[PDB]
Amino acid sequence: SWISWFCGLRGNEFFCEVDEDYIQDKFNLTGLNEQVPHYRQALDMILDLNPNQSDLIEQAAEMLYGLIHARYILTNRGIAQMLEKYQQGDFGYCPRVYCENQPMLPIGLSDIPGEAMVKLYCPKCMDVYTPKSSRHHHTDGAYFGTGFPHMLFMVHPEYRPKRPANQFVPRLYGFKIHPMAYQLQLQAASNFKSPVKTIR
């Protein structure tokens, strides 16, 4: 099948296998015809149903599946499937030290394709991070949505991790840096990087 192969490819670890059950009901695929070119022939390649066109149709099927994915992973079933991957840490671990390697969730900064690549949401610190592995630096963010992880914890509130136990305390010979001292520091950088005279 096409679905199982695509999700099994190198770089597509973040994806879950969308049930054909969901894709055959055309209720769910609304508006997607006006989003991708060659929609009918791209949908055919997904359900397993001339070197000019057959190349472009493969790319349009990749863009279709991904948009469908963004909708699918918001559903209770799509949530449960990602939640399974999340429990095995398929989405990487948080680089923040005081998050203690919290498992992450994929997220898109934008919903429209071509604008941003995929990013990682940490349930603990609640900030977003660029995937550490440079094999994921080509997955379009639009395929996971802006709302996926937020929807997840709304459906399963139980899965929120408690706020970080500890915090980073900068110490210089064990004296803490007073915040008066960054306000200063931040000028000296402004006042510094100033237009050097451009000789006439």
Binding site: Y173, G174, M180
Partner: protein, 328 residues
């Protein structure tokens, strides 16, 4: 062997004190609460210390933290005992608190915040009366510590902090300071190149308080003649040459003679033969308003190879160069 020397003032002051006063190795340090202070900005760096403008978060007051890098435990206990001994004497820096890092264990000293005037600023601003006033103030500090039996051993422009707005002065950095016991041989790797006295360069270990007076002389010369530093040696050996070119070789050879000092053969080749120059060579249109007959006379009485013939702090205070000051 080399001929023994004593101090002509405050000779036996430490030897009839209780041992608590001078046995710094024995001293147990009162520790403070480190969490009181947080660092604002870097202010300065020594060879033994890092200096920060801090703030005491308990009372929001501005403070200064001198962090001491890894040295022997001796040197730190010594600086502290000396600072406690000299606490609240004229123009002596007031130690406000001692703290320690728990993990690093690297000790730090806290002070009341000095509004020191920039060093270059006051080299542009100081008048003929100003130098005289501040020289007197340094002497009050030098006479006090010498009376209390301690030589500073690192007198130089950077160790004298002037709040020129409030016309008040403070002698700092007692990290090289030491107790004076009659007839003891001391380390000569003290001071700073341009302020080391001849007894240090020729390796004469039985020195005393008078070392400070030479250092003070170099300070005076630098100020009145506006040439910093005055004796600008490239290294320890050239330092004695720069001095020999001013004070002459004649008095210097008479001096190593007087005390059976053994010279490092190194000097012979570079020392040579030099006349004792008149101070008038160093006087030009730009420094003249600071130079007077009384200034030259005073300076000359400080800068003597023979440490035993320099003016003591108390005597210095009586010189005609100060007459205009003392009345106030």
């Amino acid at each position: 062997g080399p001929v023994p020397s004593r101090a002509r003032v405050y000779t036996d002051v430490n030897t009839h004190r209780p041992r608590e006063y001078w046995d710094y190795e024995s001293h147990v340090v009162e520790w403070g609460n480190q969490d009181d202070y947080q660092l604002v900005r870097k202010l300065g760096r020594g060879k033994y210390s890092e200096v920060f403008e801090a703030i005491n978060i308990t009372n929001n007051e501005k403070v200064v933290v001198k962090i001491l890098k890894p040295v022997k435990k001796k040197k730190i206990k010594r600086e502290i005992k000396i600072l406690e001994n000299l606490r609240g004497g004229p123009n002596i820096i007031t130690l406000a608190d001692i703290v320690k890092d728990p993990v690093s264990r690297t000790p730090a000293l806290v002070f009341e915040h000095v509004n020191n005037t920039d060093f270059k600023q006051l080299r542009q601003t100081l008048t003929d009366y100003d130098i005289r006033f501040y020289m007197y103030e340094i002497l009050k500090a030098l006479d006090y510590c010498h009376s209390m039996g301690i030589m500073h051993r690192d007198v130089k422009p950077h160790n004298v902090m002037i709040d020129h707005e409030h016309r008040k002065l403070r002698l700092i950095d007692w990290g090289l300071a030491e107790f004076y016991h009659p007839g003891q041989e001391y380390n000569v790797r003290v001071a700073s190149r341009y302020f080391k006295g001849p007894e240090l360069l020729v390796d004469y270990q039985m020195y005393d308080y008078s070392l400070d007076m030479w250092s003070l002389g170099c300070m005076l010369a630098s100020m009145i003649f506006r040439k910093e530093p005055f004796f600008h040696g490239h290294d320890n050996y050239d330092q004695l040459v720069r001095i020999a070119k001013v004070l002459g070789t004649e008095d210097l050879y008479d001096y190593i003679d007087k005390y059976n000092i053994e010279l490092d053969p190194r000097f012979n080749d570079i020392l040579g033969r030099h006349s004792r120059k008149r101070w008038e060579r160093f006087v030009h249109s730009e420094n003249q308003h600071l130079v007077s007959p009384e200034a030259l006379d005073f300076l000359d009485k400080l800068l003597r190879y023979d440490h035993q013939s320099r003016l003591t702090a108390r005597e210095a205070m009586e010189h005609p160069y100060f007459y205009t000051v003392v009345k106030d």
